[PDB]
Amino acid sequence: DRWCVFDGFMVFCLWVSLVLQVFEIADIVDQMSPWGMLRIPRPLIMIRAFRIYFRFELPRTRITNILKRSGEQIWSVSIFLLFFLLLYGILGVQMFGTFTYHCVVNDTKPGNVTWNSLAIPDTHCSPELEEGYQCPPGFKCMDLEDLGLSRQELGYSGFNEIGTSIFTVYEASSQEGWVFLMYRAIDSFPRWRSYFYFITLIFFLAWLVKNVFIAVIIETFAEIRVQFQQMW
Amino acid sequence: GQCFTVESADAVCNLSDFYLSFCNSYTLWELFSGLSSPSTLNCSLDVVLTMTTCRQCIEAYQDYDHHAQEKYEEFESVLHKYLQSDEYSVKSCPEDCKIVYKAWLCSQYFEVTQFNCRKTIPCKQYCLEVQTRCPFILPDNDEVIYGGLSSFICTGLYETFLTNDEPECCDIR
Amino acid sequence: EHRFRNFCRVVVRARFTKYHQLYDLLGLVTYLDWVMITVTICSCISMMFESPFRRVMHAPTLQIAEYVFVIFMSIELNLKIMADGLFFTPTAVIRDFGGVMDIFIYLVSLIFLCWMPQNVPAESGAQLLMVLRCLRPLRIFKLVPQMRKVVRELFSGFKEIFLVSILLLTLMLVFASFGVQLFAGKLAKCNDPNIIRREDCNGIFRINVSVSKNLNLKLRPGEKKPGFWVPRVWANPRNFNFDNVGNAMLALFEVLSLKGWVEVRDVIIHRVGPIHGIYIHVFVFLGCMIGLTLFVGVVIANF
Amino acid sequence: CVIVFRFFSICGKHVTLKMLLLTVVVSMYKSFFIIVGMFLLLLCYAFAGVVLFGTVKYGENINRHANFSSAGKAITVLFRIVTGEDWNKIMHDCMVQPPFCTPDEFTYWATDCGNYAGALMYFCSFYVIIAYIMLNLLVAIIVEN
Amino acid sequence: MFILSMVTVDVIVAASNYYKGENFRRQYDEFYLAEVAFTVLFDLEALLKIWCLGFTGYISSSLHKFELLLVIGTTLHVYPDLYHSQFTYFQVLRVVRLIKISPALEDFVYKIFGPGKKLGSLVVFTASLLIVMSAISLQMFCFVEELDRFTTFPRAFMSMFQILTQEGWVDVMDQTLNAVGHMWAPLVAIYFILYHLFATLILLSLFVAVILDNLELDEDLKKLKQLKQ
Ligand SMILES: *[C@@H]1O[C@H](CO)[C@@H](O)[C@H](O)[C@H]1NC(C)=O
Ligand SMILES: *[C@@H]1O[C@H](CO)[C@@H](O)[C@H](O)[C@H]1NC(C)=O
């Protein structure tokens, strides 16, 4: 299966790794350079280990047709998942803002944020008097963005724009780190919005859409069974 | 039993009527009876009636009280920032947690037997009181994950917490 | 001895084409079934207000709702027993697990109504009675043909589910014995990170209190992180320890859920050695990628 | 909202998207009764937890957000348990015992403690029944549709 | 039956060695002696079986091989040097023999595993993918400063396995994003997102499909059963 080019490229990668290690012995480069990324294709030689076990009783045409059908199904399901992710990201953008307001000690100055200034544990709030959690006496709700906070410490968590919202929706779909996101949304926004949004996201994306891939794989195995059975 | 807050070390050196500024449950009699500060480890209620030694011992006790007060201020600053102090428990109130923590801290910085106590309780048992009063505060787990251990704990694995020769200080709740 | 039994027999069986589906849905269950379903739903709604502060034993509305449910269920069960019998008739009230469950629920409700305790100690008989009473919404599983069909389909694969459970328990027992033999008392260390030897784990030390995991406020010119002074203790993680077979099995069961197993892995590596991480990795791969997969496969195959 | 509705409508102009959306909605219709059964079990366990752990002292995960003080809060916590939450920490918090809590000798709503074995059995049984059994039924329905 | 009872008693005694304190020998205690005795008993059993059925006859059973492997592992583990070490993994495996008590359980295990070649191929492919991805990531993030998840190969494998398990993979991705900076952040983020997508929506799905296929009756058997109707 055109393995000559693959083996030649593996030999080239071996040459590159050998000369890089020779330079390492020369101590010219302290090994902390990104040059080690040149070794990235080397583990691909493990594929050469299993080249023989990649042929079965099924002829080439049957395997190609099975793979084409599976790939088309996977592409369709991927398009469906992308559509759902875009829908939920748009809903999050238009239903939530930036989870930046926090309850802090009322004697706080901008550009002087301290870990001691935050509540224990740190929580969110809303400047509105009837939306979300309300800070107790001695604590006031503040933006914590005019105070000098940066995006790096806040990270990619939230619904700042379409990309951030889509990434957060995908993260929540894996049933990872969304309950705390739900608590933050409840603190920063009306309860019903958070409940409806997160319940729908979990029920659809985390249960239905994810299991659509399992259904596709099951159909792939059924097609494999059919091709195995109809060969003779 | 009238209040007598110790202010001047050089004022004096009957003997059970000197309440400390912060740990007001201890007197000079309570301190010189058993406690021995390492710097001047000769104050064992005998040299009192004769420091210079008495003055230095009193000043060291006051410094201990000051350090305990500072640590208690840190603790109450931490607790004040805890928003759920009004809902963490029904039988527990933050004031009770502060009082028991203060008692435990005074015990830690003064490990002696308090006399003239109407209610007798093992002094180390105050630690358990904190576990039974103060809310669960989640410690930081960046250097090393603590599992689910509380910030304040008293008993360890296969360890007898209560033992013999317990100081058994005063009981106040 | 026999008169007016036929009255109940006729009553308990009453039922009932543009909207044919609507007619069928209306005539799906008997009138007595509709009454029982409505009463059960009202009782569930009433219980949804049974907060610990708003105790049922004190709130008049919840008391009235419980009275209504108990009276109506007693009347329905008595009429059914009088009409269709109890045991002799093959299609009597007691015919399968559903009849037994309904009898149990009725007895629990009647006992609760008659007793009405004023003080329920923790882990006491009255608390268990209330917990059993909380099983009331299960009657909907018996009063609807679709729910009974779903329950029957699910219980069809009971033997396969039990066999997979036996395999999982065998795996858990093996790995729990391994963990007990290798880690008995070796997962406990001083809460103070700086102190290493157990002989020095005493006194007090200042500990940093967790504030926010999603914040990275690195500006600390001369300040210290929030925290306070606690005594040093040589203690177990309090969430998973291998001091006994039961604790090991519980910890492995928690790990199997793939919730917080990273904490267990880090604790094992830091407190035992990097070699033993192979143990937890193998356990996770053999249980989470197979055992849960086995359960999913057997349930899907049964369906 | 109007733009969102139109974007939802655009799914019907693509054959693959239309087929997948029909699959999802028909699977939901078929699994309606399974969802009802799951909700019934969740409600039963919510009542049980309210009776048991209604006054448990706040722990690692038990707070003003996740607690069994009210039936609605219990329902929400139970739903979140089987959907990617640290349920083991919740159970351990419900497994609090003295001297961590002040026991009461008269009533269960003033003890601030929890039933150790009760919490263990409750949480393990709930997770096994929901997260390991009926979700597989939902998966099977999805595959069928 | 006696062998099964001895296995059960031995494993129960071994698992009952609960922690009691730091003042216990754990080198010549009663539990070690009991392990020695049960290892001796099983060695005698294995030798007797080999004698009765012949060395070739015993080894040709195609299933006593695991029993002999456990015998060798327990014999090695009996030494104090290897006691309570990785070799203990062999000892606790003896409960596998207990699976012989129920023929129904053995039949269920064989059916749920079905053709062993297919499940073995799936497991081998999964392990190969894990190794390849771990090596690629390790070579990608070995030189990144203030980073610990991709320093050595074991740590890279642990990180990739954690991402596969979906528990805290977002934390790993966030740490990597903070470590790389801003210029390389979108690229590594896309790499991790693609890996997570592939893992979650391929590997577990293949596991489920293989399990169902093993449970699903063979097509020829299904046709035969339909014919008998
Ligand atoms: C910032 O906080 C520190 C700590 O209290 C204080 O000393 C300083 O004056 C503050 N500066 C400003 C500008 O708020
Ligand atoms: C902050 O709130 C506390 C609570 O009463 C109050 O004592 C203090 O004066 C406030 N500080 C302000 C408003 O700067």
Ligand SMILES: *[C@@H]1O[C@H](CO)[C@@H](O)[C@H](O)[C@H]1NC(C)=O
């Ligand atoms: C608390 O944080 C500071 C700052 O990183 C650190 O130096 C200290 O060791 C931490 N506390 C403990 C008990 O490790």
